[PDB]
Symmetry: D2
Subunit: 481 residues, 4 copies
């Protein structure tokens, strides 16, 4: 029985590996090119972020608390998953794990309404989960050499929350996939073919047709656009946008690196500052985030400067004199309703693994096992049912909660710069931002409100793009009510 996995990121390869190992009866073919155009995974550090990803806003919603529980469950799978992938290689392939622990730093280069609230939410989430952690003296954090005006005054050590080399992970997944009898076919899917409510297979961009009983779409930010061509699915699969992220590999001045992940809490519009250790005198610094209504594969000047400025001031001034090896750009799959698209469709044999935004790589072994269990007639992981791909848009927050959040995040872009303004200006800007965002939210839809990250993108998009989204929301409402 033929299975085609569309996409060669962490999610496609993780599901490919689990099918190939688990299902000796199926021939599994994985599509995607070595260039990995718009690929999130190669641009990732990556942090195995569960507690580090906690925000007050996320944990204020039932859907956010459910997503967090799944991130905590995923962390338990990583040690055996890494062992099983390194087992198919040798010493020369390098180590997947680059750090065991994370330090979260609190500095004043940001908004109190995000950074202070989020630091308290991380502490509360760790205490509630009984996770091992300690608030530590900043003086005890090794390696860091911040600008004194940008320095942390509080620090939180999270034990067993670490990082992987995303490049070594991708290489280990491909090697493990081939060892288990998987086939890599380096072309893109152009079209999923279906008739009589069942997948027939995939047309490739070299003109070929590949037959299959099962198609798993794990094409990152392209996943919904690929499935939306099939009858009715345009308004039944929530849209996925590009959360364009910029990161960099730097060769440090002295070849040193920190022993732990160093990070802030999530910041304005789900960007954040972090350093992930790498082998061989390299560090990863990340990572910007901007929701784009169309794909973008190149860094902007603004993104590169903000990333470098935050890292050199808030983490280590020695990075200033360090050599830039690579500016990396990738698209976090940004779901329009703020939650992932994991599981089966109304089309027999059609599955989706996408819309994982900031933490698909961390959740990958859990999500892979879930979808593979479903494909085998199992029930997979409890609590992933709410994130089924064919659904009405989730409304995880009130319009009022989102309007408060989008104004706070807008103001946070100033405080994170950090700006220097006359003291009356911030209050003036807060007062004049409220009305326009309230008017936009009211005009977009009577029922759906986009989360803050997408709402700012819509606010500053062309009138034609806003009108097309008004029509999309109206057609979704029609379909599900």
């Amino acid at each position: 029985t033929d299975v085609i996995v569309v996409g060669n990121g962490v999610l496609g390869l993780s599901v490919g590996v689990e099918i190939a190992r688990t299902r000796p009866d199926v021939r599994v073919t994985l599509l995607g090119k070595p260039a990995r155009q718009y690929g999130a995974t190669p641009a990732a550090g990556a942090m195995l972020g569960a507690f580090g990803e906690v925000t007050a806003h996320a944990l204020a919603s039932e859907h956010g608390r459910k997503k967090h529980a799944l991130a905590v469950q995923a962390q338990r799978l990583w040690p055996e998953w890494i062992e099983s992938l390194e087992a198919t290689g040798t010493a020369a392939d390098g180590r997947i794990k680059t750090a065991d622990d994370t330090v979260v730093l609190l500095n004043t280069v940001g908004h109190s309404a995000l950074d202070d609230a989020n630091f308290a939410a991380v502490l509360t989430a760790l205490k509630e989960a009984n996770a091992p952690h300690e608030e530590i003296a900043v003086e005890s954090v090794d390696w860091i050499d911040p600008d004194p005006n940008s320095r942390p005054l509080r620090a939180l050590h999270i034990e067993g929350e670490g990082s992987v080399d995303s490049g070594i992970l991708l290489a280990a997944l491909e090697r493990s996939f081939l060892q288990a009898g998987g086939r890599l076919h380096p072309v893109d899917a152009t079209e999923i073919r279906a008739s009589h409510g069942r997948v027939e297979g995939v047309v490739t961009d070299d003109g070929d047709f590949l037959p299959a009983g099962h198609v798993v779409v794990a094409a990152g930010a392209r996943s919904q656009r690929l499935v939306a061509a099939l009858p009715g699915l345009a308004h039944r699969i929530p849209r996925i946008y590009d959360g364009v992220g910029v990161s960099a590999l730097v060769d440090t001045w002295d070849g040193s690196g920190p022993a732990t992940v160093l990070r802030t809490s999530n910041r304005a519009f789900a960007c954040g500052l972090h350093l992930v250790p790498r082998a061989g005198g390299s560090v990863y610094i990340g990572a910007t985030n901007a929701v784009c209504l169309e794909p973008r594969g190149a860094a902007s000047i603004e993104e590169t400067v903000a990333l470098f400025n935050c890292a050199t001031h808030q983490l280590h001034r020695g990075l200033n004199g360090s050599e830039l090896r690579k500016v990396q750009v990738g698209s976090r799959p940004a779901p329009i309703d703020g939650f992932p698209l994991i599981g089966g469709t109304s089309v027999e044999g059609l599955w989706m693994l996408s819309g994982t935004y900031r933490d698909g790589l961390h959740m990958s072994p859990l999500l892979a096992r879930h979808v593979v269990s479903l494909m085998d007639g199992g029930t997979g992981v409890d609590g992933l049912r709410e994130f089924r791909p064919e659904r009405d848009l989730i409304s995880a927050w009130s319009r009022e909660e989102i309007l408060d959040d989008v104004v706070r995040h807008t103001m946070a872009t100033g405080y994170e710069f950090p700006w220097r303004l006359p003291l009356e200006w911030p209050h003036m800007m807060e007062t004049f931002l409220q009305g326009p965002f309230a008017e936009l939210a009211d005009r977009l839809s009577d029922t759906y409100t986009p989360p803050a990250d997408l709402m700012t993108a819509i606010m500053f998009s062309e009138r034609e793009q806003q009108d097309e989204l008004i029509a999309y929301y109206a057609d979704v409402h029609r379909e599900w009510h």
Copy 2:
């Protein structure tokens, strides 16, 4: 009576008092006001004899603004003989009224291009049109200045015969000249003007006394309209005047030096600006902030003092940083609600007004004095003052659209003048989000009247009750004149 009472002891009241006393030796002229000069604009002034230095693109884009500028140019011609006539009543030991003959206008980048670049070009054009002597000079040739390099000027304009006076020595010379001409000083305040059968009878003072008069000249600064508005019908016939609260400072320089000229920028956000006026005895005057306040204020805010000092130390001379602060001065520019002065006669026989002169009453004083004295003698005074008669419908010198463009530009200029450091997308975001609220305010205040930018920002950030009282005021004025 043929007795004259001048209400007010600032530059305007004393200047008119001197001109009346010298021109009518047959009549008794009495001047009211106390030596404290509460909220007094004149003692807080440097002061610059600003004509060309006061030019803005926005002012010269209106007919009323061009008329106000023509009068400033005419006033400048009177200053040399006026000063000679005042110093003539004193001796060398009284000190010199004039502290500088010339002005240098500096162009730096610590401000909005839409104000500073437009205003510098407007000053150059106005000087050329008036055939005034001036030269664009090398910045390196400007005497004394030692700016922060990131705050330095890259262009400089020397204006010949546009100078400064010591406002304290001017006030002393005016009082001395007033007494020498037979004027009487009565150091009390007027509480009420008495009139009946369309004619002034005189003035009740705050010690309970009644002083009779055939002529009353109101030059009481920002209190002038409140004083006249008590008389029948005049409450909606005399445009309101608000307090343009200005902060300045006297500094003893580190080495006792000072520049040989006035140093200034063009007028900046909401009619503030940066200037240094030389003084004798190792002192310099630095000014000056401006904020229209709906009620009087007699104390500097922290924000005003810091902005004044920061601009002077960075843009003029870093040596001022180490210099000793002698005095923070606060005074009220009389800020007329329609943006133009109140000069001349009333529907009440013998009642005259000299007020609402905002930034340049001191500069215009010899011209305004001669104008009102000519009118009191049955003359027509100075040509082009007619539009600025005190009993009038509110002037609309600009379109609502021109004022809305100006108030947004001035708001943005408060950022660039700080100077702020922001992400590059933020200024355009703030411009876009400022437009709607200012347009909504303008539309709500009145169908016919629009306050100038300086007052519009004060109204925007005032209490709902103060906005509603202004809506009622505008409606009552409309009723009275239409």
Copy 3:
């Protein structure tokens, strides 16, 4: 008895003498103008734990000064009761706050602010003082710029503030009630012969006889006594620690319920707000050691004071009305420690060189000197601070050179500056050599503390050479 000086120390000792010796005539000199007066420019904080620095507590002399500050705090409640007792409700309240909050923000050098916050916490724990580290969100009233906000806060119970003006009025009233005489003239000269005080010549030409003269003339105290034979090189010099503060009427008439402060910052300046009655707050306070007196604020001092308060404490102060810029001279002793007690001249006493905390220590210092004048031994730990002494060397030259470079760099971080990231390390490297060369040139044995060392570094060559001569003459006298 003649007390020379009408600040907190002179009036406090005057009150204690007049109350304790009703048999003796006590006359207090000084003018209502209080030229260069430290006391009227003070908030004032009853600073014991708030004044703790890592540098101070690293020396034996610094630990002794701190112990005395802790002892002084215990005397304040009864002292205030005894002074308010001589007045009525209409005189106003001396005490303006009971408690202090210390804020830690990043608008400063880690090497000062982080070290000093840890030192304050340690000193509170060691003294068993009641205190709590609190959530910043729980600090009432404050509205900082988010980029200037505190991330840690420390509530110190029973460390409060007084209105310095109401204290001065209460001391004068209490002095008169106890039979003291106020003579509003200055002393020009102390007269002594056969190793004994005869009295004081005043600036109106008069001679006032006395068996006892107590010099509490603030920053003028040593210059006054140095005229007497040999005392020029036996009484440590006192300089002017010129301080700028301000009274502000708040936008809404509100004020905080506690003192709000940082730890001491570059060259012993600091940021604090002291509550006052009637919709006023006190903000302070700058500090610059000047080799000559200065009675006017500089532009730079006024801007630094206002900028720190509006950003780090409350943005609402920006729109608040300036009522008064105050300037006073902290008596800055050349060896960093006060001059308290008796001299080799019989009947000649000194109370001076108290720098940042003479007002706080006043009831303890007053009782000490009055005990000594009565043949007692006063307070146990004050002996090292006797006014007739060789200059104290409380720190190694190396410790002071590290401190002066750290404090110089802290003037940048406290601004706060924005510079290319290589510049701070470049400036640290190029500051070390010149300060080491200055220290080596001034003397083989004495090193001025950082606050005075920066003043000497940027003074005229003639002023440096006069100090080299002074240090050499002191060495001669004592070795």
Copy 4:
């Protein structure tokens, strides 16, 4: 042999290769170098045809600097025919070498007055002295630019006929023209020049081969002196060349637009500068940082990338902020230790050098190529270039005092160009404390030689062992020539 080997495939090697191949059709010319162009200056260049734009007050204060400037002016005259002759060997699809005809020099306050104001005046003086066509223009008339108002220019200078080329299209045109003239491209590096009996024999390549030749022209950029220094005595007879590491970037503009002219500042701290060179197809070039490194570096630092982008987005066009980064480019300007190029013949028969051209070798290339080809043919080439012969005692173009003033000014300029915000006493404090250490370094390095400011800062912040090796180098040069 009569065979010629050109060692190096940058603008200078290819330009000389083309001129030899075209002028000596009888001889085999082989050009060495790899398509990677490791550390290559030319591919990282915009490039500006900078003659007047490169003028500084410091350069024109020395006789050697005035001679270098005269040669840059002469080179400009050759470019039109040179470009025609190179495009002639291609077709329409190869694209155009010339990307702009004119340059605008902008003066803003994001820099030190002691560099930017002095250099702007020096450019104006040099244009007037040369009778070159130019105009000081209104900043409002400069097309395309959209600066941050706090970073905006207040003066602008239009230089007619001073333009730019696409360095990539130039390199492709030079290779094609070299082949068309009968040149051979051998894509390997030289490891060693072989000579005996005072004559070149040829070149050993890094693939182990030996290539015989009668003539070897070394145009290996910053590697040129290290290659020749192996030959007897030449270690102390050919001035050292260091790496002037430069960072630039190609950006796809938000709307596909670009300016019609080069936009630039005068040269800034340690011979960095801000400029935008137009490119075809919706791309712009922005440059360019400069740091002398004692060892080669092939990667941009974080600091360099941020400074380049921040200056361009604030001072030229805020729209670049939202523009897509296509490429960060890094190349090594050949930085001669005595500040002047190494052009011409050696004491070794058939050995020639074209190197040490720092910021303007690409601009001078057609003149330098014709000069060396004339010398190889027994001519005297171009009149003023004999002073820049490669085998020489180190030039001392400035007094030690002039260089100590310059290095302190340039150090302070790194602050003002950031731009920093500091307490007003700090800059004077840092100036005072920088003077002593730079004077001590200069005194310790040598009794006779002083490195120019750009190299002096690199030496100041290098390891003690690197300083000691330079002291030995200077002593060995002194020994050799005195």
